[PDB]
Short mmCIF file of all heavy atoms in Angstrom, two decimals:
data_model
loop_
_atom_site.label_atom_id
_atom_site.label_comp_id
_atom_site.label_asym_id
_atom_site.label_seq_id
_atom_site.Cartn_x
_atom_site.Cartn_y
_atom_site.Cartn_z
N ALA A 63 0.88 -1.22 -0.01
CA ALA A 63 0.00 -0.01 0.02
C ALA A 63 0.89 1.26 -0.02
O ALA A 63 2.01 1.18 0.53
CB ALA A 63 -0.93 0.01 1.22
N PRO A 64 0.40 2.38 -0.61
CA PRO A 64 1.22 3.56 -0.66
C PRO A 64 1.61 4.04 0.71
O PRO A 64 0.82 4.09 1.66
CB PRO A 64 0.29 4.54 -1.39
CG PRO A 64 -0.65 3.72 -2.14
CD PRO A 64 -0.88 2.50 -1.28
N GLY A 65 2.84 4.53 0.82
CA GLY A 65 3.41 5.06 2.05
C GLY A 65 3.80 4.07 3.08
O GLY A 65 4.40 4.52 4.12
N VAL A 66 3.52 2.82 2.90
CA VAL A 66 3.89 1.80 3.90
C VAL A 66 5.40 1.49 3.78
O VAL A 66 5.89 1.42 2.66
CB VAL A 66 3.06 0.52 3.67
CG1 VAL A 66 3.47 -0.56 4.68
CG2 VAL A 66 1.60 0.82 3.83
N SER A 67 6.08 1.38 4.89
CA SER A 67 7.46 1.13 4.89
C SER A 67 7.81 -0.25 4.30
O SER A 67 6.97 -1.17 4.33
CB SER A 67 8.10 1.22 6.27
OG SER A 67 9.40 0.77 6.34
N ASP A 68 8.99 -0.40 3.77
CA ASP A 68 9.40 -1.67 3.16
C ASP A 68 9.60 -2.80 4.14
O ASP A 68 9.82 -3.92 3.75
CB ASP A 68 10.66 -1.45 2.34
CG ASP A 68 11.82 -0.89 3.11
OD1 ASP A 68 11.58 -0.39 4.25
OD2 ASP A 68 12.95 -0.95 2.73
N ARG A 69 9.63 -2.49 5.44
CA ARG A 69 9.93 -3.48 6.45
C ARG A 69 8.92 -4.62 6.43
O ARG A 69 9.21 -5.73 6.95
CB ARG A 69 9.99 -2.86 7.87
CG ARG A 69 11.05 -1.81 8.03
CD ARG A 69 11.15 -1.32 9.45
NE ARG A 69 10.03 -0.48 9.84
CZ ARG A 69 8.99 -0.93 10.54
NH1 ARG A 69 8.90 -2.15 10.95
NH2 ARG A 69 8.01 -0.04 10.84
N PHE A 70 7.77 -4.42 5.92
CA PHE A 70 6.72 -5.45 5.80
C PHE A 70 6.64 -5.94 4.35
O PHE A 70 6.60 -5.14 3.43
CB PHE A 70 5.36 -4.95 6.26
CG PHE A 70 5.47 -3.94 7.37
CD1 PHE A 70 5.49 -2.55 7.00
CD2 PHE A 70 5.54 -4.29 8.67
CE1 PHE A 70 5.54 -1.58 8.03
CE2 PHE A 70 5.60 -3.34 9.65
CZ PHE A 70 5.62 -2.00 9.36
N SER A 71 6.55 -7.24 4.14
CA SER A 71 6.39 -7.85 2.86
C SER A 71 5.59 -9.10 2.96
O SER A 71 5.52 -9.74 4.03
CB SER A 71 7.76 -8.14 2.19
OG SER A 71 7.58 -8.46 0.84
N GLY A 72 4.93 -9.49 1.89
CA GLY A 72 4.16 -10.72 1.84
C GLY A 72 4.03 -11.23 0.43
O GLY A 72 4.24 -10.50 -0.57
N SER A 73 3.65 -12.52 0.33
CA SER A 73 3.49 -13.10 -1.01
C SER A 73 2.49 -14.24 -0.83
O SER A 73 1.85 -14.39 0.18
CB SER A 73 4.78 -13.58 -1.55
OG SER A 73 5.71 -12.53 -1.75
N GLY A 74 2.42 -15.10 -1.85
CA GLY A 74 1.54 -16.24 -1.86
C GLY A 74 0.41 -16.11 -2.87
O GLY A 74 0.22 -15.10 -3.52
N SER A 75 -0.33 -17.24 -3.04
CA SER A 75 -1.38 -17.30 -4.02
C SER A 75 -2.37 -18.41 -3.61
O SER A 75 -2.07 -19.18 -2.72
CB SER A 75 -0.82 -17.57 -5.40
OG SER A 75 0.34 -18.38 -5.37
N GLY A 76 -3.52 -18.41 -4.24
CA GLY A 76 -4.50 -19.41 -3.98
C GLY A 76 -5.12 -19.32 -2.68
O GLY A 76 -5.69 -18.32 -2.28
N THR A 77 -5.03 -20.43 -1.89
CA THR A 77 -5.60 -20.51 -0.55
C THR A 77 -4.57 -20.30 0.59
O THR A 77 -4.97 -20.47 1.75
CB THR A 77 -6.31 -21.88 -0.35
OG1 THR A 77 -5.43 -22.89 -0.61
CG2 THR A 77 -7.48 -21.94 -1.31
N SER A 78 -3.32 -19.97 0.27
CA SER A 78 -2.31 -19.81 1.29
C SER A 78 -1.58 -18.49 1.10
O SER A 78 -1.18 -18.16 -0.01
CB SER A 78 -1.29 -20.99 1.21
OG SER A 78 -1.13 -21.40 -0.13
N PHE A 79 -1.38 -17.77 2.20
CA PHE A 79 -0.66 -16.51 2.20
C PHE A 79 0.02 -16.33 3.51
O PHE A 79 -0.29 -16.97 4.51
CB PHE A 79 -1.60 -15.29 1.91
CG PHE A 79 -2.41 -15.39 0.67
CD1 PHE A 79 -3.66 -15.99 0.63
CD2 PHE A 79 -1.91 -14.87 -0.49
CE1 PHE A 79 -4.36 -16.09 -0.56
CE2 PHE A 79 -2.62 -14.95 -1.68
CZ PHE A 79 -3.83 -15.53 -1.72
N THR A 80 1.02 -15.48 3.50
CA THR A 80 1.89 -15.27 4.67
C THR A 80 2.38 -13.83 4.73
O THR A 80 2.72 -13.27 3.71
CB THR A 80 3.11 -16.21 4.68
OG1 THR A 80 2.66 -17.55 4.64
CG2 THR A 80 3.89 -16.07 5.96
N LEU A 81 2.31 -13.25 5.91
CA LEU A 81 2.84 -11.92 6.15
C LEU A 81 4.17 -11.97 6.87
O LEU A 81 4.33 -12.63 7.87
CB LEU A 81 1.87 -11.11 7.04
CG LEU A 81 2.10 -9.57 7.14
CD1 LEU A 81 2.63 -9.06 5.83
CD2 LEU A 81 0.83 -8.88 7.59
N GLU A 82 5.20 -11.35 6.30
CA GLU A 82 6.57 -11.42 6.80
C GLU A 82 7.07 -10.02 7.08
O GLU A 82 6.93 -9.09 6.31
CB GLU A 82 7.44 -12.07 5.74
CG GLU A 82 6.86 -13.25 5.03
CD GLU A 82 7.81 -14.41 4.83
OE1 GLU A 82 9.03 -14.15 4.87
OE2 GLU A 82 7.35 -15.54 4.68
N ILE A 83 7.65 -9.85 8.24
CA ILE A 83 8.31 -8.60 8.73
C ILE A 83 9.77 -8.87 8.98
O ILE A 83 10.12 -9.66 9.88
CB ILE A 83 7.62 -8.04 9.97
CG1 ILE A 83 6.07 -8.09 9.81
CG2 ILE A 83 8.09 -6.58 10.17
CD1 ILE A 83 5.32 -7.63 11.07
N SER A 84 10.66 -8.21 8.20
CA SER A 84 12.09 -8.49 8.30
C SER A 84 12.63 -8.07 9.65
O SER A 84 13.32 -8.82 10.34
CB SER A 84 12.80 -7.77 7.17
OG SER A 84 12.54 -6.38 7.19
N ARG A 85 12.36 -6.82 10.07
CA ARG A 85 12.90 -6.28 11.30
C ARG A 85 11.76 -5.65 12.16
O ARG A 85 10.98 -4.82 11.61
CB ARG A 85 13.93 -5.18 11.00
CG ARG A 85 15.34 -5.74 10.98
CD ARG A 85 16.28 -4.90 10.10
NE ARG A 85 16.27 -5.27 8.74
CZ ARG A 85 17.36 -5.21 7.98
NH1 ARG A 85 18.55 -4.88 8.44
NH2 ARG A 85 17.24 -5.64 6.71
N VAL A 86 11.65 -6.04 13.38
CA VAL A 86 10.55 -5.61 14.25
C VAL A 86 11.03 -4.32 14.97
O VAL A 86 12.07 -4.30 15.58
CB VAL A 86 10.18 -6.66 15.23
CG1 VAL A 86 9.24 -6.11 16.34
CG2 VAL A 86 9.46 -7.79 14.52
N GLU A 87 10.22 -3.29 14.90
CA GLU A 87 10.50 -2.04 15.56
C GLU A 87 9.54 -1.84 16.73
O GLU A 87 8.52 -2.53 16.80
CB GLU A 87 10.40 -0.84 14.59
CG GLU A 87 11.55 -0.70 13.65
CD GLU A 87 11.38 0.42 12.61
OE1 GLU A 87 10.31 1.02 12.59
OE2 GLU A 87 12.37 0.68 11.83
N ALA A 88 9.88 -0.91 17.62
CA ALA A 88 9.05 -0.71 18.79
C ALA A 88 7.69 -0.22 18.48
O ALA A 88 6.72 -0.36 19.26
CB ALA A 88 9.71 0.27 19.76
N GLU A 89 7.49 0.41 17.32
CA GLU A 89 6.18 0.96 16.90
C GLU A 89 5.33 -0.04 16.16
O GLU A 89 4.27 0.31 15.69
CB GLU A 89 6.41 2.22 16.09
CG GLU A 89 7.17 1.97 14.77
CD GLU A 89 7.20 3.17 13.90
OE1 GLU A 89 7.13 4.31 14.40
OE2 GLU A 89 7.34 2.99 12.66
N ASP A 90 5.79 -1.31 16.06
CA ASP A 90 5.10 -2.31 15.32
C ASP A 90 4.06 -3.09 16.11
O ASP A 90 3.45 -4.07 15.62
CB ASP A 90 6.05 -3.26 14.68
CG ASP A 90 7.13 -2.55 13.82
OD1 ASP A 90 6.85 -1.38 13.42
OD2 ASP A 90 8.19 -3.13 13.53
N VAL A 91 3.89 -2.74 17.40
CA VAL A 91 2.97 -3.50 18.25
C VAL A 91 1.54 -3.23 17.86
O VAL A 91 1.13 -2.07 17.69
CB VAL A 91 3.22 -3.17 19.73
CG1 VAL A 91 2.22 -3.87 20.62
CG2 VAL A 91 4.65 -3.52 20.13
#
């Protein structure tokens, strides 16, 4: 989404998807 930092990424297709965060920051709670 526009303006969202690159620290979050995801992929997948069909019936399976996954959310991946490379580095966790204190503001990510």
Side-chain angles (χ1 to χ4, degrees):
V66 178
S67 173
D68 57 343
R69 297 187 288 100
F70 328 93
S71 194
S73 299
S75 34
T77 56
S78 34
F79 302 89
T80 304
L81 192 36
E82 321 221 337
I83 314 176
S84 56
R85 267 156 271 217
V86 168
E87 285 175 355
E89 60 174 28
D90 305 341
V91 176

